Amino acid sequence: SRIGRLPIAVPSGVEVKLDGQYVEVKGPKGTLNFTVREPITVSKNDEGAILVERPDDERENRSLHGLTRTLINNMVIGVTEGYEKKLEIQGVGYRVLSKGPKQLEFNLGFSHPVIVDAPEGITFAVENPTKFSVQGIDKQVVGETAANIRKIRKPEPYKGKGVRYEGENVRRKVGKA
Amino acid sequence: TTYSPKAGEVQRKWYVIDAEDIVLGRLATTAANLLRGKHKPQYAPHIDTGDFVVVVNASKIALTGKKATDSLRYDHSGRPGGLRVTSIGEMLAKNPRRAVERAVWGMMPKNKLSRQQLKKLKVYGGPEHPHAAQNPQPYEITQIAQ
């Protein structure tokens, strides 16, 4: 495991508690929880880093080895930096507005606007009535939130109208030629 | 003349099996063997010489493969379109006593005496049972080598 054997660059001022199989990360942004899976050992590498090991050269061990390595990296860098994944809206009459830092309201050509909530771990940042993003301190739940937001009105192939990923390659077709 | 037990001659003991992480089939074979007194030298098919079997942690019974969803238990009321199906996982979560009792009953002779002896199998999904007055003794499912 090239990534797995690659250790974790711990940033400054972050408390990383390795309670055996439990991970606690504390910094100026939030707290995160995950029980490190049993067949992986974790050490502090003279208290300044993380060494993540695999008991055996069987396949499942390397699977979980890489997963845990970049999981710890993801979690610490989330407590220190935060993320972003961006979406954009196209089409006449389509707008996105904010009902707070935790909410979104869409006019996607429906009969009524759609109200979108978020977990406490995900916060929205709508910068334009035609551009917005989803952030948090996680990286799968951000993906699923953005996917559901796109699913609310996915791009039609006839004019491109709808919600799309910021650089999505919407495969279009010409209709009434 | 070969020995034959007399009514209440053979004493019937109480046992408690902890079904935590025990395969359903192993537990059912062991319980059926104990209920009918097949481990006793005084065994008789026509006289109930078996013991009382208490099974705790019946909700934690182990199932291999995809049995928890794909292994189905069926019932029929007799009237057309009256078939119900459930899975063994849902049975264990919902009615663990019924699941264990079905598994055990399928493994006993189809008798009047077997219907009487199945009443000695007390099944509980939790780790506790109400039969402390009978003092069930722990039973470990074990194999004899060779």
Partner: protein, 214 residues
């Protein structure tokens, strides 16, 4: 799981009124008289929460020692009918509490439960809506007949639940989403818009509508 208000009453008959829109409404009149809380069922003792109410006048010589003891524990005078109401807020009722018809207001939707009128042994044509055979055109002594009752060799049996003649009526019936037209609390009278099961003088349980309305 659900919170239900309830009262016990007697079916007195039916009348009619005109509402504010000058529409004729049929109303059942219910003597929804005084009900006392005669027992309270709790999850600690009975395993479920409910209120056993008592309704009706009874001759003291017709009450027995067990019934007298039950009512004495409740602290009430003996009642003819004891009916349990399954409500999640049975903990708010006290033993001997007086429950009157004013539990319901002038526009509440209610469920009315009663034992329906009996018809004796009815045939398939009356109790199950069967069509018999024609009155003429050769029909031979089978005008009100059930027809076929099964197939053939496969299966050599009549299936369970086949609709046949038998005794019909005298069964629990609930009519849902009936609008309370009016409540006269001092004389314990309730006007409910519609028809409710049972003959006149039969015991009725009036409860909150489970499905609210339509």
């Amino acid at each position: 799981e659900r919170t239900v208000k309830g009262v016990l009453g007697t079916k007195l008959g039916m009348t009619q009124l005109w509402d504010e829109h000058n529409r004729l409404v049929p109303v059942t009149v219910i003597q929804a008289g005084p009900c006392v809380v005669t027992q309270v069922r709790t999850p600690e003792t009975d395993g479920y929460s409910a209120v056993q109410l008592g309704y009706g006048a009874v001759k003291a010589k017709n009450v027995t020692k067990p019934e007298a003891g039950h009512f004495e524990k409740a602290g009430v005078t003996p009642r003819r009918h004891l009916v349990e109401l399954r409500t999640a807020d049975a903990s708010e009722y006290t033993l001997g509490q007086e429950i009157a018809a004013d539990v319901f207001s002038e526009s509440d939707f209610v469920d009315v439960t009663g034992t329906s009128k009996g018809k004796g042994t009815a045939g398939v044509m009356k109790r199950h809506g069967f069509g018999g055979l024609r009155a003429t055109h050769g029909v031979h002594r089978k005008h009100r007949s059930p027809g076929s009752i099964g197939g053939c060799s496969t299966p050599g049996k009549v299936i369970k639940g086949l609709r046949m003649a038998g005794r019909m009526g005298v069964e629990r019936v609930t009519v849902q989403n009936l609008q309370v037209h009016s409540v006269d609390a001092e004389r314990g009278i309730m006007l409910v818009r519609g028809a409710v099961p049972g003959p006149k003088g039969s015991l009725l349980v009036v409860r909150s509508a489970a499905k609210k309305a339509a």
